[PDB]
Design a binder for this molecule. Structure first.
Ligand SMILES: [Mn+2]
Length: 354
């Protein structure tokens, strides 16, 4: 049970159903665009199905400008292949599914339950002003039960989010490396974090809604914010931060799922004269600790655990775990060590599933 669509009008590759921007949704065919007037055929820089694409001229998670495909109810695996891309997200069923994919022909995969017998997807606002294009889709049915598998939903900022290509990016958020440390046969990992995000934004602009749409008992909401929240331009006091964070935790707990809060690690240069790495007062850490106790959530003090690791390897090596000339953003290696520490901590606490 696999449906394959090659979007665009330049070339149609074998094994794929060619879908052009003017192909209006036709129920007798089972697929097509709901509002073709806002779709456009465009060239793409890659090979095969990546040589062409369709561009969504109208977007937004609630936009009717979607590509629809009728499908028997159940759980589906959706592999997305974009066209020429600066930075874009994928939306389906009215909410975000993949956050900020980058690069022409960017690809990623996600699972989604189909309950009304039809999938409605679009590529949407990641970076405003850039082209939101789609080159291909591979839709495969995983189960007749339209229910999601156990999943770890990750919330966060630039030090947590996904960078593309997923397995080749020079930079990475530890949420992107999480899958390399937990059992895939136990958990699915959906890293919904985004660069430069704060608590207020994660809550109000779509990311939380996307997670509340599917999170349920058995799942985990792994949240790490506080870095960007301290920037004055957002005018988000520690008090507001704490309030917003509290609300998100309650909303997620209201779904029966569990919450794991994480204190964000510090800067690569937070070393004292004695060579000890300390960042105990950064990124509103104080409020995160309090919230864990007050709202009874699980807690990974990655701030301290990571500092202990940096202290044990020295300033020079620690510097090699962050982007060059960048003391805030971890590179792939740093992201991998942070993820390692995070899971090692979850196991030490004996948290179910780890
Ligand atoms: Mn094509």
């Amino acid at each position: 049970k696999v449906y394959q669509f090659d979007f665009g009008s330049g070339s149609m590759e074998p094994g794929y159903i060619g879908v052009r921007a003017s192909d209006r949704y036709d129920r007798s065919k089972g697929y097509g665009f709901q509002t073709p007037e806002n779709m456009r055929d465009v060239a793409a820089s890659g090979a095969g199905v990546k040589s062409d694409a369709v561009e969504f001229l109208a977007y937004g998670t609630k936009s009717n400008n979607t590509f629809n495909v009728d499908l028997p109810n159940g759980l589906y695996e959706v592999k997305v292949t974009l066209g020429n891309t600066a930075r874009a997200s994928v939306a389906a069923e009215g909410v975000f599914q993949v956050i900020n994919m980058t690069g022409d022909g960017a690809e990623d995969t996600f699972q989604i339950p189909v309950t009304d017998g039809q999938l409605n997807l679009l590529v949407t606002e990641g970076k405003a002003g850039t082209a939101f294009t789609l080159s291909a889709l591979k839709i495969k049915k995983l189960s007749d039960q339209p229910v999601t598998n156990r999943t770890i939903y990750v919330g966060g900022d630039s030090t947590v989010c996904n960078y593309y290509p997923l397995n080749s990016s020079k930079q990475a958020g530890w949420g992107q490396m999480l899958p390399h440390y937990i059992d895939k046969h136990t958990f699915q990992v959906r890293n919904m974090a985004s660069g430069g995000q704060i608590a207020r934004g994660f809550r109000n602009d779509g990311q939380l809604e996307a997670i509340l749409k599917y999170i349920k008992p058995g799942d985990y909401f792994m949240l790490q914010l506080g870095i960007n929240d301290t920037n004055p331009k957002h005018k988000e006091s520690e008090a507001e931060f704490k309030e917003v964070m509290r609300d998100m935790i309650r909303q997620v707990k209201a779904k029966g799922a569990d919450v794991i809060l994480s204190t964000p690690q510090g800067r690569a240069t937070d070393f004292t004269s004695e060579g000890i790495h300390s960042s105990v007062n950064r990124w509103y850490r104080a409020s995160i600790l309090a919230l864990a106790e007050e709202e009874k959530t699980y807690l990974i003090d990655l701030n301290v655990l990571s500092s202990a690791y940096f202290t044990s390897i020295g300033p020079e090596r620690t510097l090699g775990l962050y982007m060059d000339g960048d003391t805030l953003h971890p590179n792939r290696a740093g992201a991998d060590a942070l993820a390692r520490l995070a899971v090692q901590e979850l196991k030490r606490q004996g948290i179910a599933g780890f």
